[PDB]
Amino acid sequence: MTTLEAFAKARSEGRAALIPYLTAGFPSREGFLQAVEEVLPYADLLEIGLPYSGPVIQRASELALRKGMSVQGALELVREVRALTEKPLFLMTYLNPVLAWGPERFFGLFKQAGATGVILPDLPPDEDPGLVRLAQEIGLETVFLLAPTSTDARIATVVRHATGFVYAVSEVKDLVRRIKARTALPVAVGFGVSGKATAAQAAVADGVVVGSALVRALEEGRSLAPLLQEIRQGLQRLE
Numbered sequence: 001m002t003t004l005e006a007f008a009k010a011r012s013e014g015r016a017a018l019i020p021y022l023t024a025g026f027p028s029r030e031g032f033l034q035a036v037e038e039v040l041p042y043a044d045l046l047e048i049g050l051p052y053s054g055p056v057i058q059r060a061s062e063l064a065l066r067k068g069m070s071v072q073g074a075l076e077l078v079r080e081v082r083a084l085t086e087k088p089l090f091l092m093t094y095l096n097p098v099l100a101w102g103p104e105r106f107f108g109l110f111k112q113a114g115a116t117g118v119i120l121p122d123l124p125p126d127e128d129p130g131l132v133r134l135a136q137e138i139g140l141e142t143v144f145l146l147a148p149t150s151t152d153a154r155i156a157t158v159v160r161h162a163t164g165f166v167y168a169v170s171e172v173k174d175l176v177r178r179i180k181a182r183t184a185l186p187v188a189v190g191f192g193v194s195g196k197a198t199a200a201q202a203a204v205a206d207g208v209v210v211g212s213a214l215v216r217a218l219e220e221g222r223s224l225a226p227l228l229q230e231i232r233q234g235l236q237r238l239e
């Protein structure tokens with residue numbers, strides 16, 4: 001289903017959507033695919049990170065690159081994941097590799113590989129609307145980030161360019177409230193959720209990203225379901 005439908009389904013079920021984040025090729029190519037199999041049952045949508053040169057996420061990118069991850073490698077993995085699910089798949093990437101390959105080619109390749117959209121953490125959309133438009137015209141939803149320091153004007157500016165959803169990073173209820181005042185777009189948040197309690201604090205958002213917690217689980221060689229189940233139980237809105 002579409003990104004909006006994935007978020008809507010979660011909301012209707014009275015819960016914040018669970019969005020696993022997995023670094024492409026971490027801890028290995030096979031390990032990554034196995035991880036995808038384990039998180040999909042819990043995922044409303046999935047984020048796949050393109051490793052490029054937070055401490056935990058940094059460790060994962062570092063190991064992935066040391067093992068040979070590349071844009072071509074990430075492309076094949078996106079195809080592999082698309083073969084396993086019809087759920088929304090978002091590629092998170094810094095601008096550097098996009099510029100190296102050329103925006104039109106980079107975005108075109110990932111859209112063709114099966115990506116639903118891209119998350120561009122280091123691109124203020126208002127600074128290059130043309131680049132944003134290009135990705136959108138190619139068929140990719142474009143997610144941009146907002147920090148707690150964002151003024152009303154900054155929030156308004158970013159939500160004007162975002163599609164799919166808006167990503168708020170680091171209290172959570174306050175930031176979510178302020179963003180919803182300027183948009184009907186789903187709002188996902190990421191602040192190191194690691195269990196039921198921290199997930200409950202984030203339950204107010206339309207979606208909650210889980211990245212660092214999964215890196216740790218993978219490093220420790222633990223099954224992922226127990227962790228995701230605790231988080232899912234915390235994402236469920238109660239009386």
Ligand SMILES: O=P(O)(O)OCCCc1c[nH]c2ccccc12
Nearest residue numbers: 021190191192193209210211212
């Ligand atoms: O919030 P955590 O610890 O679950 O990480 C979620 C991973 C999303 C993520 C990966 N790399 C980033 C760079 C900037 C902002 C967010 C990210």
